[PDB]
Amino acid sequence: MASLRHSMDPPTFTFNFNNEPWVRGRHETYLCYEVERMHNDTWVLLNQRRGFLCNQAPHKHGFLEGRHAELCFLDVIPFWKLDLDQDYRVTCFTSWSPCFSCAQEMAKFISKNKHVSLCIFTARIYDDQGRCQEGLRTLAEAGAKISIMTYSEFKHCWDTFVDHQGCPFQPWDGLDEHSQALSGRLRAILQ
Numbered sequence: 025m026a027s028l029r030h031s032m033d034p035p036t037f038t039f040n041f042n043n044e045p046w047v048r049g050r051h052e053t054y055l056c057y058e059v060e061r062m063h064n065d066t067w068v069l070l071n072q073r074r075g076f077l078c079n080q081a082p083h084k085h086g087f088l089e090g091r092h093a094e095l096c097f098l099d100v101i102p103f104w105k106l107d108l109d110q111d112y113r114v115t116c117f118t119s120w121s122p123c124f125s126c127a128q129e130m131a132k133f134i135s136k137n138k139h140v141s142l143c144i145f146t147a148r149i150y151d152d153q154g155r156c157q158e159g160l161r162t163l164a165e166a167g168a169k170i171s172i173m174t175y176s177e178f179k180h181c182w183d184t185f186v187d188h189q190g191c192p193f194q195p196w197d198g199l200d201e202h203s204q205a206l207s208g209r210l211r212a213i214l215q
């Protein structure tokens with residue numbers, strides 16, 4: 025089934041998406057997603073399909089060894105029952121970028137599922153035991169568009185996924201400087 029969570033508490037967002045590069049207790053990955061369908065050269069938002077999730081930590085009555093957020097995300101796609109005659113764009117906003125094995129699985133998914141275009145915006149690059157450059161390039165090579173979250177993307181996710189009650193997205197200290205540094209890093213990685 026495909027009814028994932030729609031809204032998070034403001035502190036859940038702020039803690040997890042703050043783009044200072046340090047782990048600082050951010051052991052989870054949050055992944056927010058939206059789906060659009062192509063119609064007359066325009067991307068049409070399918071608002072009922074949106075949601076967010078996080079990784080499942082190791083639990084006796086869950087996954088004994090945990091399940092990364094990216095794999096949980098891939099697991100939900102078949103339950104959407106997408107119309108294979110249509111074209112879709114799936115945008116995911118991630119608090120950390122994928123580990124290499126997840127990037128590999130995501131790349132395999134998009135290679136095989138050519139009705140789907142994937143766009144990823146990440147708040148931070150997870151170093152991934154020195155493999156992050158390889159994981160990001162593997163995703164890009166399979167056709168994913170990879171970008172760094174900047175102010176506009178953080179604001180968009182706040183507006184869309186947070187129970188903000190009309191309060192504005194209020195940037196944490198250093199947001200622009202962290203986004204600019206990370207964007208410079210990603211530009212180098214992708215070339």
Ligand SMILES: [Zn+2]
Nearest residue numbers: 092122123126
């Ligand atoms: Zn992973």
